Subunit: 812 residues, 2 copies
């Protein structure tokens, strides 16, 4: 027999269209899965869909009778947009939170999400079991790893009413969170129906006579989807290039289907050029599938009324890039990259998928005098933080021609308020005067113990980081929980007993370094790297230095503040407090440990690796950080170059080891502006150069030397001096004296000419651009918001200062 609660839970899930969670432990989980599929199928006939099975690397009749799809863990990106009647996970040791989010959301309501666990003598051994991902966290310095993610995972089950844990013998355990489940009253489909189903069929039958909306509204499955289609069509039918409709919805709500049917409606309404801009064409799979579904519903014929152009040469073979329409009239659905805004001159409809994840300048450039459709995932898996969506909406409101804001709430595959969706959104967390504040260290042994106060505080800090993330990734939660040396610091205001403090700033610090010199030389003779550390293993490779990585240091993995309290001084105060704590200025575990009650580790430096940005760089420089490295190949999804800043926090020790690194980086950066850096704005490059020089000034031996006649004559021939003097007098065109620009720029920005001649910020920026970035006058004028004549007018005054110094130098 079987426990009554298993068929009861399955029946409740089938009737209420909600998912059911089952966890099987033992060595013969196949029998349990077969018996759970038989029970699920015996009560309902309209849900017998395919079964998804995921592994890293009776029953015999069961496999040969039902459609079973096998998917690898690394191939879970291939099942995006599908829908399966029951999902199976085989290897616990491999399910990262990314895998769980990707593989659970693709189950229709009433199905079963079955997770198989290996036979265990006591569930109490789950908290210490070898993750296949733990191998990446461990390092030579820190080898042991205490698994805390599994601890919270097992405890989270008790908070889900649809989650049942069963054994090989099909017996419920007390850990199960749905042992108190009760049968629901039988339904009556003769007259009783959900109000949503009545509303949808009403909004469908009302517009059935009209075309093409009548035939393109029979594809929507939710009321919110129908309303989204209605407003999209009422903006398309308006045929006004002064309209802009944005669609923000959680993952799985059906943004792609609504936008695809809207694109089909735009095609049917007589639109010639339609452009879809997305970060990657592989995201445009379900969208184009629903565009094709709308075309089919519009009585179009394949290969006779439309041809599909698919890009096979690059990596994304399956990606659709172009669709041609030649039935009503020549129409094209072209996919362009977000950086290709130069092709939107004749754009009639530009649809920006995942507009939140697109960098803000790219979104600003993609908008024009046409009709713009926008999509954003503001919650759920792969979502965007609330801060970025708020910034985008604020920009749209400030610029607006006309902006329309619609939202989807009701999911498609499962009923609203699904229990399993609630649990997987809790386990993966997928949804005062600055001087008065104090910093506390958050203990990770209790923060992941699923205590109600601990869980509430964990959700608080997690949500803070969520907003500060162009794309949400729940793997960072596992990295934070199971890392061997990651420390979490939070900044709270003055708080009294009985009230949980409100986190205004959260700092995650990772301990790095203490790598043996033998390992350094072993790695430096090859290209392979342990990849455990970042700042040491990167400097030791870039500078070919075998002494830096043997130090002890801290990497600030993530520092985020409350978006409502940003730019008020909380982040800088938290950073200063952390630095002072690491400088030895402070002399059931409790969740919060004050900084004055734990002994800091002896650290020689603190470092950070982050995407370059003028505001971020200004903040880090104000925090006494100096650059050591700057990547040349910009990040494809972000558009920013990785920059590494290191601070010599330890006092009473010579900060000369960092002086050499800063000086080496400073001079390299000077002429690296012609290599993958030509695109940098002049002001940003000037600030980075100034910061690198300030860092290089730590070493007294790196102080610049004066310029003498003996070395000057080795650089400029007397005819070059004559040309410079002629230009300074205004008797020569600036194009003639232009190969001397690299030499003068290098002389000034390496310190030889810095003391002799005084240049302001604008003159320094123009000199840097024209000398090291090799920019034109037009580009420099546009970047600096100055007329072309004024750039040269202030450029001659730079020459009238260098020429005078050179003349006074040669004469005396």
């Amino acid at each position: 027999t079987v426990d009554s609660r298993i068929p009861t839970l399955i029946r409740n899930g089938l009737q209420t269209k909600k998912r059911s969670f089952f966890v099987v432990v033992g060595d013969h989980a196949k029998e349990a899965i077969v018996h759970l599929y038989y029970i699920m199928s015996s009560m309902d006939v309209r849900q017998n869909k395919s079964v998804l099975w995921a592994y890293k690397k009776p029953f015999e009749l069961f496999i040969s009778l039902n459609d079973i799809r096998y998917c690898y863990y690394k191939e879970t990106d291939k099942i995006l947009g599908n829908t399966y009647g029951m999902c199976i996970l085989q290897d616990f040791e491999a399910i990262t939170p990314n895998i769980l989010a990707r593989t659970i959301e693709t189950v229709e309501g009433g199905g079963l999400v079955v997770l198989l666990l290996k036979g265990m003598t006591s569930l109490k051994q789950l908290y210490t079991m070898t993750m296949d991902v733990h191998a990446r966290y461990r390092t030579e310095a820190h080898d042991d790893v205490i698994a805390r993610f599994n601890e919270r995972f097992l405890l989270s089950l008790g908070s889900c009413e649809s989650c049942l844990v069963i054994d090989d013998e099909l017996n419920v355990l007390p850990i199960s969170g749905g042992k108190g489940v009760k049968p629901l009253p039988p339904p009556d489909e003769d007259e009783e129906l959900s109000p949503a189903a009545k509303e949808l069929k009403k909004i469908k039958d009302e517009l059935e006579d009209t075309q093409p909306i009548g035939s393109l509204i029979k594809l929507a499955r939710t009321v919110d989807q129908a309303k989204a289609l209605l407003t999209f069509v009422d903006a398309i039918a308006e045929k006004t290039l002064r309209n802009t409709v944005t669609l923000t919805a959680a993952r799985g709500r059906g943004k792609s289907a609504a936008m695809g049917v809207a694109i089909a409606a735009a095609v049917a309404y007589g639109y010639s050029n339609i452009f879809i801009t997305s970060p990657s064409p592989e995201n445009l799979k379900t969208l184009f599938e629903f565009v094709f579904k709308g075309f089919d519903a519009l009585d179009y014929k394949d290969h006779a009324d439309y041809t599909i152009i698919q890009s096979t040469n690059p990596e994304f073979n399956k990606a659709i890039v172009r669709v041609n329409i030649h039935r009503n009239h020549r129409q094209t659905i072209q996919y362009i990259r977000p950086q290709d805004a130069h092709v939107l001159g004749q754009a009639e409809l530009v649809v920006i998928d995942e507009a939140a994840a697109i960098p803000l300048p790219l979104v600003k450039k993609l908008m024009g005098p046409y009709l713009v459709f926008m999509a954003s995932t503001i919650s759920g898996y792969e979502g965007t933080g609330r801060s970025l969506s708020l910034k985008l909406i604020k920009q749209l409101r400030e610029q607006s021609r006309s902006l329309k804001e619609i939202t989807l709430s009701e999911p498609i595959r499962y009923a609203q308020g699904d229990n399993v969706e609630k649990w997987l959104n809790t386990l993966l967390c997928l949804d005062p005067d600055p001087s008065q504040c104090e910093l506390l260290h958050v203990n990770r042994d209790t923060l992941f113990s699923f205590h109600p106060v601990s869980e509430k505080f964990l959700q608080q800090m997690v949500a803070l980081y969520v907003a500060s993330h162009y794309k949400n990734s729940p793997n960072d939660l596992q990295l934070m929980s199971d890392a061997p040396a990651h420390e979490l610091f939070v900044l709270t205001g003055p708080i009294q007993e009985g009230r949980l403090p409100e986190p205004l700033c959260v700092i995650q610090v990772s301990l790095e370094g203490k790598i043996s010199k033998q390992s350094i030389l072993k790695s430096l003779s090859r290209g392979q790297q342990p990849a455990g550390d970042l700042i040491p293993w990167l400097v030791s490779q870039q500078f070919q230095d075998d002494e830096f990585a043997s130090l002890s240091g801290a990497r600030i993995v993530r520092i985020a503040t409350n978006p409502d309290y940003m730019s008020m001084g909380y982040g800088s105060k938290a950073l200063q407090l952390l630095v002072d704590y690491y400088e030895g200025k402070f002399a059931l575990p409790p969740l919060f440990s004050k900084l004055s009650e734990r002994r800091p580790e002896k650290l020689d430096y603190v470092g950070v690796s982050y995407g370059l940005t003028q505001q971020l760089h200004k903040f880090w420089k104000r925090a006494q950080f100096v650059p050591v490295y700057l990547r040349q190949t910009a990040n494809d999804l972000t558009g920013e170059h990785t920059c590494v800043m290191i601070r010599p926090l330890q006092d009473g020790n010579d900060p000369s080891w960092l002086g050499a690194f800063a000086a080496d980086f400073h001079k390299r950066f000077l002429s690296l502006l012609s290599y993958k850096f030509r695109e940098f704005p002049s002001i940003l490059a000037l600030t980075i150069e100034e910061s690198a020089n300030a860092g290089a000034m730590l070493d007294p031996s790196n102080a610049p030397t004066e310029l003498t006649k003996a070395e000057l004559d080795q650089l400029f021939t007397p005819f070059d001096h004559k040309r410079l003097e002629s230009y300074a007098n205004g008797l020569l065109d600036y194009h003639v004296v232009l190969d001397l620009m690299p030499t003068i720029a290098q002389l000034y920005f390496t310190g030889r000419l810095r003391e002799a001649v005084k240049l302001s910020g604008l003159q320094q920026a123009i000199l840097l651009a024209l000398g090291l970035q090799r920019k034109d006058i037009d580009t420099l004028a546009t970047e600096l918001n100055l007329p072309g004549s004024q750039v040269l007018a202030i450029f001659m005054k730079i020459m009238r200062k260098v020429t005078q110094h050179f003349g006074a130098l040669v004469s005396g």
Copy 2:
């Protein structure tokens, strides 16, 4: 009374629809013009159009009764595409051939082209009268100018049967070429009609029922125009993106009108994106006027069915750049520059106006998988040489999807075979073993004497230069004729008496130099230049040298060979013969003077200024020329940088004055590749650098020195050497060692490392690109037609040679 031949000629012109030429001499030409307008108007009533009057800076009733348009000589570009019933030219001293061509072609058949000459005691004083343009030819070295253009102008009249020369008293002179004119028999318009007029009305009434061709064929005025419209519409109605129709016709035949009505037909046929690519939007004035005429004939309404977008911010205010159509669907007529081929992704119809004048790579890029319309002016004023049109047609035939070739012959404003058009196409000339050949000097005193043999030979050489010219300019004829020091050299094969030799190569040499040092210093202290000379006044400004321009030199203004005999060795042989002639190797004027019968001038150098091109540079370098200067701003109409090459022809004299210039240019060019030169192909830049180094080797003191440890340690720190050695071993990514690339490239290409390490052509080109041009691996791989991996694979082998040399240098 009036001479009978004046009303007779006017009546013949009115009846035959041919223009009439009248030249008036005296101080009261107003009376003659009034009496010629009265006579013209008294016989015909359907031609009383506006009168065009051109000046540099009875009759009273005449001005206030007829529409008179006044146009300045510098503003004659503003009357392109118009049509006037009678043209008047007031100032002889200002009518350049460009003005004559621009102002004569805008007269309808049967009108009068009246040229006013100041009262002259004897027409014999015309050959010596002060041109307002002569001031530009004269120079300090050569001041006197003998006017030969006026000489041929006066004699050319006798070859025109419709040209009458009259005085203030209206008396015909023997110089008149139409004194033997006789009255034509009166016509009969009741039944007799021209076959062309019957053919046109037949091809119109046949398609009257059909639309939109029926309403868009009533705008054509010639049979050839109607056929061009028919084939354009039959290619548009075909709606095939595998069609390409080119239209080659002389100036004034009506290419613009046919193409405009074709664009209107394409709009009416349901084309969404239509792009018109032209060298300048001001040429797209009559084309868009006829597009608008076709729209009006298609019953479109202004400001309700189409809106016109005109670019007012730039210089071309009147230029139309965009036309929007919203009749049933959004259609657009966008003007793009020829270098904007990246916007033709959705192009449904790309119409290339003046395709011959567009550089060949730009035309190759503008063509795609759509319908392409092409226009070319292969004859007449502002035309293109036959060689360029032949190259374009050959490229089209070799690439062809489908190519259609149509031609227009019959002009619009005047009858075919017009007499005045014949004369203005003669006055302005607007239409063997290599070792066995010999070079002859063509005397300019008899070449412009209008002798039949002299005129035939002048037309021969002129036609040779015409083909070698992206845009024909008849001002070069006046410059050749009236220049004070221009010498013409021609290359002919073995020829016997009684037969005029066939010119296989024509060389035009201009004598330059001998500028006083006082004038050099006077000009060098300002920006103003006499502009008489080019090579001296350019080197003396770029190099700030006060001794070069005082030499004596020759500038090869134009060297062209027969396009049928190109790349066979005639040009190089002619150049070598000219150089030997100037090196003193040869020890009713006759038209041809052998090189052994005239004393060459003592010349120190021979130079040439030309648009840079790999083939042209290779030819000049083979001719022992070395560069001295290279412009940064490429020519807008051509896309090529001006390069100046100077050869030290004189033997027995030290060529060290040029060694300094070549070395200064060579070292500057090295790092100037990052300034307006980044776009140069690697091979071309390498060849230019090699040629500049070969030129700099003339001075023994410019020989490169070895590389020593003392100077090497001043460039690379030991950590830089460690990084280079690590990269050479393949243990480091190539991105790390990239700021050392400028230093290594400069060391190798300035000669210090040239002897120590041996590099092939490909390695040298890659090193030059990556070091001095700062190109990426992808761009270099695409330019060199090699995979990206192979570029780096051969790039590491460059480093494995430099690193070994550096190690052997530091060790010992």
